[PDB]
């Protein structure tokens, strides 16, 4: 959608349109209400670990091995 007057929708985005090629192109309006909403994931936290102990990389689960 393109607004020629520009004022209700300025350069803020609406996140695009969730559309597909293999979509149904018609849904029932109570199917979208009755489905459960996805879980909001965990907020960002700061954990510290050790990449190197005096030159050697430890085999902790935060490291590749």
């Amino acid at each position: 959608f393109h607004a020629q007057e520009f004022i209700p929708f300025r350069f803020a985005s609406g996140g695009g349109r969730e559309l597909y090629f293999y979509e149904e192109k018609e849904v029932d309006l109570s199917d979208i209400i009755n489905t459960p909403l996805p879980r909001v994931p965990l907020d960002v936290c700061l954990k510290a670990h050790w990449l190197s102990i005096e030159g050697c990389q430890p085999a902790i689960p935060e490291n590749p091995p």
């Binding site: 990449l51 005096e54 030159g55 990389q57 590749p64």
Partner: protein, 546 residues
């Protein structure tokens, strides 16, 4: 100047250079790239679009491999009005390629151009190309490859001959002898900081090539808003995070929660004396291990602490630099000088001035007291990606996307050094604690070590694969730590790299990369965004695990 025959002028000089002897052939291959672009951009500016795309497809294939991202911006440019709004090829067409060549190879070049048989490619050379001549040996091909790659490349030696005060403040003859500004109005609380700083220096280990440091990675675990900026305070006490959801988040890493100071009603009742100085004002009702700062309308790209551990700085896509207090945990000032994304900011190491570089191809010098900047560093031809202060804060290094690093004097705003030799946009700069050296990293995975009193980039570290996004030297200067998008923290010997350190502008740098490696330290799917050195010489890194 017939356009119809630019594929006859360029292919004639291409035939002369490749038929030369091999000592002068590697040095005369430098003017393939600027003569290809200046002939192509002059075709598309005079609206010769049909015979410009045939000039491209003939001659863009015989270019160097490190120009591949430069030619694909030129393949899009076919019209005149496409180039009239690019502003990087508009400044490339008006500037002069510097093209440092030796006098032994320039005599063969001028004996092929002063004759009237060619007489038009010589006219393009003396119109669009500078030639800076040095008296010495012609450089090798793997030495020319080390110091080229920038538009307006290989700048003149007359730019790198100004006197630079690269010494530290308080003798130091190459540094302001008596002024030695020891921080604007060094306070008793700032003098109290250096008392506990030298207690940390007592436990500081000498790193060297034997006692390799321990790296403590501070990974951001969830981070589904993209982490774009990290900074750590000088004492390892706070860690800031700039994120793509337009937030700055301060974390305390010591076991001491982040407190705001009390409100003005609570401070007005605080009685005179009876201590009541720096602990009675801290509110315990507000005490978290995490404070979120809102107010940017865009992803926060720069993050910089002040050395007194107040005054967080942040810059973002919306074109503002913001000064967050760390005593009230609110925003104080919004510095609006750019209309464009400010890619980096940093406080001075004395904490009054700060420099911010943005998409508008300048870097501004601010002072936290004026709504307008003091110095505008406006010589780059692309985005100022990085902005770093010298340890004496008289000089500002600004890396950029046109593959040049430039030192700027804070007095007079003059560019005093131009460091070229990177193949991609510079994404990290750091200074040596001596002040004599400068390490720069870019998207080519190369860490180039530059001298500052000379300006010759003596060393080259080529271990990393992807964009080197974080560099730091040790607190002693013994080790340079490099972190890239290869998810590796490489450690380089920053003493054996500067052990040797003119009249020719180069030192014939070796392939010392294998000898200078001390470790590689692959990280679990985590790009190393920040590298920090604790005052007891412990490496801190922060990554946002993907």
């Amino acid at each position: 100047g017939d356009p119809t025959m630019y594929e006859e002028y360029y292919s004639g000089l291409k035939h002369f250079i490749e038929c030369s002897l091999d000592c002068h052939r590697a040095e005369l291959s430098q003017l393939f790239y600027p003569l290809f672009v200046h002939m192509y951009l002059e075709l598309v500016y005079n609206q010769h679009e049909n015979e410009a795309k045939s000039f491209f497809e003939k001659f863009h294939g015989d270019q160097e491999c490190y120009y591949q991202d430069d030619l694909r911006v030129l393949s899009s440019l076919t019209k005149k009005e496409h180039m009239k709004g690019n502003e990087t090829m508009l400044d490339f067409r008006t500037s002069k390629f510097v093209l440092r060549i030796s006098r032994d190879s320039y005599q063969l070049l001028k004996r092929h151009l002063q004759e009237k048989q060619n007489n038009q490619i010589w006219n393009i050379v003396q119109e669009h190309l500078y030639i800076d001549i040095f008296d010495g040996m012609p450089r090798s091909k793997q030495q020319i490859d080390a110091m080229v790659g920038s538009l307006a490349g290989e700048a003149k030696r007359e730019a790198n001959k100004s006197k630079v005060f690269f010494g530290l403040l308080k003798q130091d003859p190459n540094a302001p002898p008596q002024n030695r500004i020891p921080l604007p109005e060094l306070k008793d609380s700032d003098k109290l900081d250096k008392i506990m700083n030298m207690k940390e220096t007592t436990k500081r280990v000498r790193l060297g090539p034997d006692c390799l440091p321990s790296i403590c990675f501070y990974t951001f675990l969830n981070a589904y808003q993209g982490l774009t900026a990290v900074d750590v305070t000088d004492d390892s006490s706070l860690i800031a995070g700039g994120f793509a959801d337009s937030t700055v988040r301060v974390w305390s890493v010591t076991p001491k929660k982040l407190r705001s100071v009390k409100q003005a009603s609570d401070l007005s009742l605080i009685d005179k004396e009876s201590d009541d100085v720096l602990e009675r004002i801290m509110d315990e009702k507000t005490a978290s291990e995490l404070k979120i700062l809102y107010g940017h309308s865009g992803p926060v790209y720069g993050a910089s602490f002040s050395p007194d551990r107040n005054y967080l700085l942040s810059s973002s896509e919306d074109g503002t630099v913001r000064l967050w207090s760390l005593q009230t945990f609110t925003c104080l000032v919004g510095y609006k000088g750019h209309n464009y994304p400010v890619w980096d900011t940093q406080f001075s190491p004395y904490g009054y001035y700060f420099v911010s570089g943005g998409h508008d191809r300048v870097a501004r010098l601010w002072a936290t007291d004026h709504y307008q900047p003091l110095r505008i560093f406006a010589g780059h031809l692309a985005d100022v990606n990085c902005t770093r202060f010298h340890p004496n804060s008289n000089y500002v290094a600004t890396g950029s996307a046109d593959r040049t690093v430039r030192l700027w004097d804070v007095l007079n705003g003059n560019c005093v050094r131009i460091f070229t030799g990177h193949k991609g946009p510079i994404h990290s700069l750091t200074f040596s604690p001596n002040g004599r050296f400068l390490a720069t990293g870019a998207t080519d995975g190369r860490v180039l070590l530059w001298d500052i009193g000379h300006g010759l980039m003596v060393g080259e570290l080529k271990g990393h694969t992807d964009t080197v996004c974080s560099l730091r030297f040790s607190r002693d200067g013994e080790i340079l730590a490099s972190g890239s998008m290869d998810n590796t923290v490489r450690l380089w010997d920053a003493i054996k790299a500067f052990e040797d350190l003119t009249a020719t502008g180069h030192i014939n740098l070796p392939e010392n990369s294998q000898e200078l490696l001390l470790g590689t330290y692959m990280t679990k799917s985590t790009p190393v965004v920040h590298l920090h050195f604790t005052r007891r010489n412990l490496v801190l890194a922060a990554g946002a695990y993907s």
